[PDB]
Design a protein around this ligand. Structure first.
Ligand code: CLA
Ligand code: CLA
Ligand code: CLA
Ligand code: CLA
Ligand code: CLA
Ligand code: CLA
Ligand code: CLA
Ligand code: CLA
Ligand SMILES: CCCCCCCCCCCCCCCC(=O)OC[C@H](COP(=O)(O)OC[C@@H](O)CO)OC(=O)CCCCCCCCCCCCCCC
Ligand SMILES: CC1=C(C/C=C(\C)CCC[C@H](C)CCC[C@H](C)CCCC(C)C)C(=O)c2ccccc2C1=O
Ligand SMILES: CC1=C(C/C=C(\C)CCC[C@H](C)CCC[C@H](C)CCCC(C)C)C(=O)c2ccccc2C1=O
Lengths: 124, 73, 147, 144, 75, 80, 742
């Protein structure tokens, strides 16, 4: 019926995906968001710092770049919040539920903002 | 002066299209042939081919000759 | 468009004290293209350039903004639904087969715009671009001359 | 004639698969099953793309919408002279036999069928839209 | 102005005569893609008097067709 | 769902039923035409609105008419 | 094993005018005659669709074969006319004496209604339209020096034209090959490689060695054209040749003794350009064509015909199978020997791609004398051959789709490459869809970024050479490697293949022939616009091919045919689902892509290559403004379109005024096409009803019932007028601009 390929069905690929926090069941949704939040918050500061409107300013560049990344984390957290409100209105994994997704979104905000802050510390 | 003339002429153009749009909506939704039997409104539908074909002739004449004169010049 | 082109060019040459240019160039269409549109676009399209920008940069930007929206409308007017509905189906397949993205899902099944809706949206882009392009040209070519 | 019962154990035609098959709709909403008896092994064209080999005897395929099942039915009937039938299968296991509805294909008139959506007038005898205005919803004069 | 209207009516009147002439044939549509040149040529020469001929048809009531024979859509 | 209606000008030629890609129509006994059969539209919940049936109808004006209505997954022809 | 042999049928079709008088005879549908105006259009749309008139493959093949003789006959008439107008209506003889200061001209207009203004003062005591086809430069390269030689070629072209038309009649009505004759693909390739290409190249090399080289050597030495020995004197008098090339004193003995180094005086490897003419050394081209002849004559002995030796193309294909691709290439030999559409799909794709390569290679390595400094000819040739390639490539998509609907058969394609491509078409199209969006954002979006930053007065935030830089380092590296090739990797080449790689410019007649082309940020951005536009065109065309037979939307599209308007307003609306409609949309995107390609070429050459050379240096036509302006949309609108349209809109009253008229005429045709593309026939048919009423009222209604164009024809008319107007606009714009400042 379906077309099976090494990319779709491989042992190394399948094992890697199961290890990611998104697919790691048995973990509290809040913890899932924090781990996912930290990873994305840290990388997000990069492009803003090196390519923002204040990139060439000596010291303001680090603050402005990371501060803008923090604002994008807040917007992303709001997107997660409303998505859970819409998607889950009326099952095995607690993440895909009205209560679970709300906890997951909250963890992403805390992890994401911390990741941005940690990235700023590394720069300076 | 330029902005005001252009502003109101474009608004007039849109409003005129709407007038004919709701005239067409009237004929479908609201018009009743039995209650307008033989009056001027029902008689417009009776020679619609004459009206449309003469509008077609006028447009063709103006188009051929106005464009033709410009191209000649 | 013909009405306002007529009004504008006849007043531009009156305001410049040379009605003869209109009287002699308006009898053939290269005259409208060369002496009205091409000649009066010069200050508009220099609102910004490699050497700097001035107060007409907003109109220069809006001028191209109008051309872009106008052209985007041509997409909806020329290409019709069936092409796009087939295309969206491959995107539906791809999303469900992509790890870490199929965890998210839509509540409204994506479909291509309807036949009638395409006509309206395409006309809207055509009309908005038509209006913005001329507004930028009208204001910039007049105020730049007499501002 | 009586309504057939679907046999899920039926083998399916030899086919290596494709990206044109079932999606999440089958898991959550419904899908369709078509079955037929083949006189011999033969290559036919899948409505989702590619070539498949029908096994001799019973065959079974699953499709995402009703038009796909009927498209293959038309191919099998006209090009191979077979008599397929298909069902609608719901996620909870319910099976609804669909085609042919009464055992006789619709193009052949059959006794016991009751006319539906038949108006005893010409199209030109429909009333004007003004007569059905404010009826509770949008409705054509053809709906009365 | 009157130079044009004479030639334009000449062309129109000659074409109308040819159309009417071939509608009495077995296959009228075949005479419209394969021109009956002998018939077309005769009509071309006789079109010099169209202004006289046209008035006589107008006065005789034969220029126009009756409304009862013209198809129209429902109204 | 779309609305499909059969009118009493039907000659029972069966061409609309043969042309329907969704099996919406069928032939039933009738006495109003020489063929003694009339087209019927029992399963309109599956009609997609393609109007192949109208293309196949020989009568003038049509004897089978489709009025496009509310859109569902079936009527929209979605496989997802 | 079937023997390869000649096989024909005697007198298959009687030669008679009976069917000329029966329009539509070829088709069972149309042979009964018209009832509506749609019949008239259908007659022409189906005229050459041979396979829709019959299923007999032999009958189709014979029609194809004779139609090709007809095409060749027309080309010979066209070529004969060009040579004739060069002999009788040109200033070629005057141009030969002063090639730099005279403009080629071979068309003269009659004096009537004042149109003789178009006979411009092109020099050489002559008045006429300046040509940009480059025929004068081609004729000089071949060694033609007199109108008599041109005239004789024109006569011979007509004799060949008559022969082609005779062959077409003969091979359809008198001796028509059988299907087995056409299916000898091994023999056809052997003859077309060794014979058509191999012998053709060898023969042309013979002309170059014995005629082109001696004549052009004396022309470049200042010898007057009328004092140069006639070509037959060079052929018959070895002493004259030995004076020009001493190796000729040894005859053909060095060739047969393998002392090939003796011919180094006329078989060279110089590279670069001749500094007198600005074109390639003719001694290099002669060695090129000798080497090509040997290569193709060897290639023409690869395939097995009748004597055991050689390859079976079927055996080669069936052997090349791997783990990842099922049965592999099985069944392709059968497809390619039974479907003309499959053959035409491959041949159009590469012939069109070849045309685009010719455009690039001829501008960079100008092969004709005095071509490089004729900027009007250089711009025209590049633009012309680019467009042919684009149109041909789209035709490849069309006829691949036609094969998919009409000739594809599942029973013969099970788990082979063709079958497996179909079974993951959603994977192919979905990924290609993503690439187009990525390329669209990150190429056109950069311009939008630049326009916005410039408008906001932040030039330091732009993608530009003086700001955030996007250097095409890979292309820059390749240029350096090719410039240094003569030192290390091409030891026997005196110079690099082209001056575009690097080095010193070549000036002819006070103008730049060619010079190094630098690649900066603007060049990086425009190359990724080209990548974007090509990928989208492929997307549209490939999607049409892969979903020609079916999709998730229309499961039985194959039964609806290659060309149909839709499958109704249901399923939400299915307008333009057919494969034909993908070719329709592909044409627009092909036009959009190649417009930017030629705008790129036009501005880059004017800004950075073409110009005048004096003591102070090189001054380019637009003064090198491409680098800093071509990175914004406003830059293209202002510095390219608005600025360079000055010539065309100011040409009234001059010999170039015809380009001004066509410039406006083409704008009109383009806009006229939007009437067909935006509207639908249902409106027009209802309009025609009212007009018919008026004709009925006056007893002047036609017997062939008027009908609005079919849905599909409305699209075909729309795109045809769109393309003609859009292309003809740029055609006028280019020629008026370049003939004036060139
Ligand atoms: C007094 C004025 C007036 C009134 C009261 C109405 C009322 C009505 N009209 Mg009518 N109409 C009018 C003027 C008016 N019209 C004019 C001037 C025109 C010509 C333009 C029309 C043309 C017209 C048509 C063709 C139709 C109606 C219809 C209708 C009905 C439904 C409207 C609806 O749902 O719109 C919903 C409106 C929208 C969803 C928004 C549309 C937005 C448009 C496309 C412009 C968008 C601009 C864009 C956002 C700008 C962006 C700029 C950028 C820089 C950011 C309603 C009875 C419809 C009907 O069914 O009637 C029975 C119908 O089909 N009207
Ligand atoms: C510049 C573009 C353009 C042009 C020239 C036209 C022209 C026309 N339109 Mg169209 N239209 C356009 C764009 C255009 N339209 C667009 C964008 C739309 C929106 C979709 C429409 C929508 C539209 C509608 C809905 C209607 C028209 C109508 C008309 C006619 C108006 C009357 C007229 O001018 O008669 C004179 C005719 C012309 C000026 C046309 C050009 C004639 C040329 C110059 C003849 C040249 C012949 C010469 C020998 C060369 C032949 C070469 C060839 C054999 C190779 C005319 C045929 C109306 C109509 O049909 O009225 C009867 C009508 O109902 N148009
Ligand atoms: C691609 C083929 C081609 C084309 C497009 C043209 C086009 C032209 N030719 Mg040329 N010509 C050609 C092939 C071609 N020729 C060939 C093969 C020959 C050799 C038989 C000639 C011999 C020839 C002569 C002898 C003359 C032209 C002339 C002309 C011009 C006027 C023709 C005219 O109005 O005739 C009238 C139209 C009809 C009879 C109908 C025109 C630019 C004339 C010219 O250049 O005048 C200055 C002219 O006198 N041509
Ligand atoms: C005088 C000799 C002659 C005669 C009487 C016939 C007669 C016939 N041929 Mg034959 N044929 C001839 C010469 C002749 N042929 C030649 C020279 C060739 C080689 C090209 C062929 C190739 C050929 C083929 C391949 C076929 C025929 C067919 C036919 C039949 C239909 C012809 C028809 O409808 O033509 C009317 C057609 C035309 C007038 C079109 C003419 C096209 C030519 C190439 C000129 C086009 C030039 C033009 C400038 C193009 C650009 C136009 C632009 C400027 C607007 C009929 C029995 C057909 C058939 O069904 O046979 C059984 C068929 O399939 N013939
Ligand atoms: C060495 C032999 C030879 C040569 C030179 C050619 C040349 C050509 N063939 Mg090929 N062909 C050959 C052998 C050859 N063929 C064999 C053995 C077969 C059977 C397997 C075929 C089957 C075949 C088909 C089916 C077709 C061609 C076509 C073509 C033409 C392609 C267009 C082109 O490049 O025009 C370049 C044009 C020229 C260089 C002009 C050359 C003109 C002279 C007269 C030489 C033509 C070659 C001919 C074999 C000479 C003897 C003919 C006869 C008097 C014995 C071209 C003229 C296509 C075509 O257009 O046919 C009309 C086509 O459809 N060929
Ligand atoms: C196809 C290409 C081609 C052709 C046709 C020629 C032709 C020629 N070359 Mg050239 N040449 C070529 C390629 C070619 N070359 C290439 C690629 C190179 C580079 C390696 C050269 C290098 C080269 C050199 C260095 C020389 C020539 C020379 C010649 C001439 C004499 C050759 C010779 O001795 O022939 C020997 C014999 C034959 C070729 C056989 C002739 C057979 C005849 C035609 C048979 C007729 C029989 C028939 C029944 C008669 C009926 C009569 C009737 C009235 C009844 C001749 C004009 C020589 C010369 O003098 O040039 C000016 C010379 O010195 N060539
Ligand atoms: C080697 C080249 C080649 C060949 C031999 C064919 C052959 C064929 N093609 Mg293909 N095709 C090609 C190239 C080719 N094509 C290219 C490059 C494209 C892309 C544009 C296409 C796109 C294409 C499509 C989309 C279709 C075909 C179809 C066909 C078939 C019918 C053609 C017919 O009846 O035309 C009859 C000819 C005409 C009606 C004349 C058309 C003239 C055009 C529209 C305008 C020309 C303008 C002119 C150049 C300049 C202006 C002149 C004016 C001012 C007077 C036939 C098998 C059709 C089919 O169904 O095949 C199965 C079909 O639908 N082709
Ligand atoms: C200028 C006119 C225009 C534009 C902008 C587009 C745009 C597009 N076309 Mg379309 N098209 C057009 C004309 C146009 N078309 C016309 C005239 C036709 C008829 C022939 C078509 C026919 C057609 C087909 C058949 C196809 C396309 C495709 C596409 C897409 C290509 C992928 C891409 O680059 O995505 C990225 C989008 C762009 C580069 C457009 C500009 C994006 C801007 C710069 C981004 C701004 C971002 C910013 C945050 C905005 C915020 C706004 C607000 C909310 C604050 C894209 C959506 C192809 C497609 O769908 O590929 C997947 C495709 O198949 N087009
Ligand atoms: C790169 C891919 C190489 C691929 C390569 O080398 O493949 C080679 C690989 C070899 O297969 P086989 O050994 O079975 O081949 C036997 C042959 O005779 C063919 O039958 O073929 C495949 O895997 C087929 C499908 C590849 C599908 C590739 C998908 C990705 C495409 C990406 C396109 C990028 C274009 C960039 C252009 C610059
Ligand atoms: C491009 C295109 C598509 C594909 C386009 C689609 C599916 C629309 C995608 C829209 C996305 C979501 C972006 C929307 C951006 C708008 C600015 C949103 C405005 C919202 C208002 C409420 C303000 C069609 O579906 C179509 C259908 C019929 C004829 C022509 C066409 C057609 O041309
Ligand atoms: C304008 C237009 C029409 C109307 C156009 C028509 C009917 C074509 C007109 C062609 C010519 C001008 C008519 C026939 C000409 C005859 C051959 C007679 C010529 C006589 C001269 C030689 C004197 C459509 O039918 C249509 C259909 C689908 C989408 C868009 C459109 C569309 O835009």
């Amino acid at each position: 019926g379906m077309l099976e390929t090494p990319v779709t069905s491989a042992p190394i690929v399948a094992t890697y995906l199961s290890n990611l926090p998104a697919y790691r069941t048995g973990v509290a949704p809040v913890l899932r968001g924090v781990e996912i939040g930290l990873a994305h918050g840290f990388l997000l500061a990069g492009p803003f710092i090196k390519l923002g409107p204040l990139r060439n300013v000596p010291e303001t560049a680090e603050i402005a770049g990371s501060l803008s990344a923090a604002g994008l984390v807040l917007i992303l957290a709001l997107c997660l919040s409303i998505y859970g409100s819409a998607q889950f209105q009326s099952a095995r994994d607690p993440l895909f539920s009205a209560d679970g997704w709300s906890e997951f979104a909250a963890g992403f905000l805390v992890g994401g903002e911390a990741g941005v802050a940690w990235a700023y510390v590394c720069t300076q | 002066q330029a902005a005001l003339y252009t502003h109101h002429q474009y608004i007039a153009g849109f409003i005129m299209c709407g007038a004919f749009a709701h005239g067409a909506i009237f004929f479908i939704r609201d018009y009743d042939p039995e209650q307008n039997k033989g009056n001027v409104l029902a008689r417009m539908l009776d020679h619609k081919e004459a009206l449309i074909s003469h509008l077609s002739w006028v447009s063709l004449f103006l188009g051929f000759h106005t464009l033709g004169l410009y191209v000649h010049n | 468009g013909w009405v306002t082109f007529y009004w504008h060019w006849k007043h531009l040459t009156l305001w410049q004290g040379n009605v003869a240019q209109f009287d002699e160039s308006s009898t053939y269409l290269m005259g409208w293209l060369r002496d009205y549109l091409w000649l009066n676009s010069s200050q508009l399209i220099n609102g910004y350039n490699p050497f700097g920008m001035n107060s007409l940069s907003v109109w220069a930007w809006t001028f191209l903004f109008g051309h872009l929206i106008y052209a985007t409308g041509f997409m909806f007017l020329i290409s019709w639904r069936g092409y796009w509905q087939e295309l969206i189906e491959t995107l539906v397949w791809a999303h469900e087969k992509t790890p870490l993205a199929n965890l998210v899902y839509w509540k409204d099944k994506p479909v291509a715009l309807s036949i009638v809706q395409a006509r309206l949206v395409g006309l809207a882009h055509f009309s908005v671009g038509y209006i913005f392009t001329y507004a930028a040209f009208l204001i910039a070519s007049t105020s730049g001359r007499f501002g | 004639w009586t309504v057939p019962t679907l046999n899920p154990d039926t083998p399916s035609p030899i086919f290596g698969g494709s990206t044109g098959g079932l999606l999440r709709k089958a898991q959550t909403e419904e899908f369709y099953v078509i079955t037929w008896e083949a006189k011999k092994e033969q290559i036919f064209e899948m409505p989702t793309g590619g070539a498949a080999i029908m096994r001799q005897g019973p065959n079974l395929l699953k499709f995402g919408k009703k038009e796909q099942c009927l498209a293959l039915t038309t191919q099998l009937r006209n090009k191979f002279k077979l008599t397929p039938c298909f069902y609608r299968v719901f996620p909870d296991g319910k099976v609804q036999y669909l085609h042919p509805a009464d055992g006789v294909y619709p193009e052949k008139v059959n006794a016991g069928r009751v006319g539906a959506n038949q108006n005893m007038r010409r199209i030109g005898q429909n009333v004007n839209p003004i007569k059905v205005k404010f009826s509770g919803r949008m409705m054509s004069p053809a709906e009365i | 102005t009157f130079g044009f209207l004479y030639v334009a009516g000449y062309i129109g009147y000659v074409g109308r005569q040819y159309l009417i002439a071939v509608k009495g044939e077995a296959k009228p549509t075949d005479k419209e893609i394969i021109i009956d040149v002998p018939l077309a040529t005769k009509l071309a020469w006789q079109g010099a008097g169209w202004p006289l001929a046209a008035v006589q048809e107008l006065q005789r009531g034969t220029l126009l067709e009756k409304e009862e024979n013209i198809t129209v859509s429902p109204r | 769902a779309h609305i499909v209606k059969i009118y009493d000008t039907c000659i029972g030629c069966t061409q609309c039923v043969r042309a329907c890609p969704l099996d919406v129509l069928e032939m039933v006994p009738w006495d109003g035409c020489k063929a003694s059969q009339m087209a019927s539209a029992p399963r309109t919940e599956d009609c997609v609105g393609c109007k192949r049936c109208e293309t196949a109808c020989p009568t003038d004006f049509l004897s089978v008419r489709v009025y496009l209505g509310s859109e569902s997954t079936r009527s929209m022809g979605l496989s997802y | 094993a079937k023997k390869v042999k000649i096989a024909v049928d005697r007198n298959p079709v009687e030669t008679s005018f009976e069917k000329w008088a029966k329009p539509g005879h070829f088709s069972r549908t149309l042979s009964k005659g018209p009832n509506t105006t749609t019949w008239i259009w259908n007659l022409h749309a189906d005229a050459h669709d041979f396979d829709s008139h019959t299923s007999d493959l032999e009958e189709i093949s014979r029609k194809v074969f004779s139609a090709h003789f007809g095409q060749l006959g027309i080309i010979f008439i066209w070529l004969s006319g060009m040579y004739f107008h060069g002999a009788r209506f040109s200033n070629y003889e005057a141009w030969l004496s002063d090639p730099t200061h005279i403009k080629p001209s071979a068309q003269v207009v009659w004096p009537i209604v004042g149109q003789e203004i178009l006979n411009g003062d092109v020099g050489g005591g002559f008045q006429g339209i300046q040509i940009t086809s480059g025929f004068f430069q081609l004729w000089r390269a071949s060694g033609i020096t007199s109108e008599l030689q041109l005239y004789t070629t024109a006569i011979g072209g007509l004799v060949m034209a008559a022969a082609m038309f005779f062959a077409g009649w003969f091979h359809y009505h008198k001796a028509a090959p059988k299907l087995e004759w056409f299916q000898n693909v091994e023999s056809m390739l052997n003859h077309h490689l060794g014979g058509l290409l191999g012998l053709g190249s060898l023969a042309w090399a013979g002309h170059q060695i014995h005629v082109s080289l001696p004549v052009n050597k004396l022309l470049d030495a200042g010898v007057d054209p009328k004092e140069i020995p006639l070509p037959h004197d060079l052929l018959l008098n070895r002493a004259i040749m030995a004076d020009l090339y001493p190796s000729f004193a040894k005859g053909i003995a060095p060739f047969f003794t393998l002392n090939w180094s003796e011919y180094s005086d006329f078989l060279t490897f110089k590279g670069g350009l001749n500094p007198v003419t600005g074109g390639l050394w003719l001694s290099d081209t002669a060695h090129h064509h000798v080497a090509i002849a040997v290569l193709f004559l060897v290639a023409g002995h690869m395939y097995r015909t009748n004597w055991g030796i050689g390859h079976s193309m079927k055996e080669i294909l069936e052997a090349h199978r791997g783990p990842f691709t099922g049965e592999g290439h099985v069944g392709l030999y059968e497809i390619l020997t039974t479907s003309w559409h499959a053959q035409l799909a491959i041949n159009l794709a590469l012939f069109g791609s070849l045309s685009i390569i010719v455009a690039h290679h001829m501008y960079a390595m100008p092969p004709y004398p005095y071509l490089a400094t004729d900027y009007g000819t250089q711009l025209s040739l590049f633009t012309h051959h680019t467009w042919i390639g684009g149109f041909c490539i789209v035709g490849a998509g069309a006829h691949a789709a036609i094969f998919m609907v009409r000739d594809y058969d599942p029973t013969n394609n099970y788990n082979n490459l063709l079958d497996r491509v179909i079974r993951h078409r959603d994977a192919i199209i979905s990924h290609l869809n993503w690439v187009c969006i990525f390329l669209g954002f990150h190429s056109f979006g950069l311009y939008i970024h630049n326009d916005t930053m410039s408008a906001l007065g932040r030039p330091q935030d732009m993608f530009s050479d003086t700001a955030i830089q996007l250097q095409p380092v890979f292309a820059q590296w390749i240029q350096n490697t090719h410039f240094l090739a003569p030192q290390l990797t091409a030891p026997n080449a005196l110079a690099a293949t082209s001056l575009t790689w690097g080095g010193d410019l070549v000036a002819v007649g006070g103008k730049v022939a060619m010079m190094p082309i630098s690649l900066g940020t603007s060049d990086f951005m425009v190359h990724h616009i080209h990548a974007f536009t090509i990928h989208v065109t492929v997307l549209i065309l490939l999607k049409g091919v892969l979903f020609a037979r079916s999709s998730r939307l229309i499961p039985d599209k194959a039964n609806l045919g290659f060309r149909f308007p839709c499958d109704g307003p249901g399923r939400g609306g299915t307008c333009q689902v057919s494969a034909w409609d993908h070719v329709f949309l592909g044409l627009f995107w092909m036009y959009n892509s190649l417009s930017i390609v030629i705008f790129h070429f036009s501005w880059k050459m004017q800004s950075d290559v073409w110009g005048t050379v004096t003591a102070s240096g090189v001054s380019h036509i637009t003064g090198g403004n491409f680098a800093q302006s071509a990175n914004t949309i406003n830059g293209w609108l202002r510095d390219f379109l608005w600025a360079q349209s000055s010539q065309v809109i100011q040409s009234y009253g001059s010999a170039l005024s015809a380009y001004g008229l066509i410039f406006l005429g083409a704008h009109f045709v383009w806009a006229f096409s939007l009437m067909f593309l935006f509207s639908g026939r249902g409106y027009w048919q209802e309009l025609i009803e009212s007009i018919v009423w008026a004709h009925n009222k006056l007893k002047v209604a036609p017997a062939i019932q008027p009908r609005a164009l079919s849905i599909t024809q409305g699209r075909a008319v729309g795109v045809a007028h769109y393309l003609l107007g859009g292309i003809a606009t740029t055609w006028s714009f280019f020629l008026a601009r370049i003939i004036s400042v060139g």
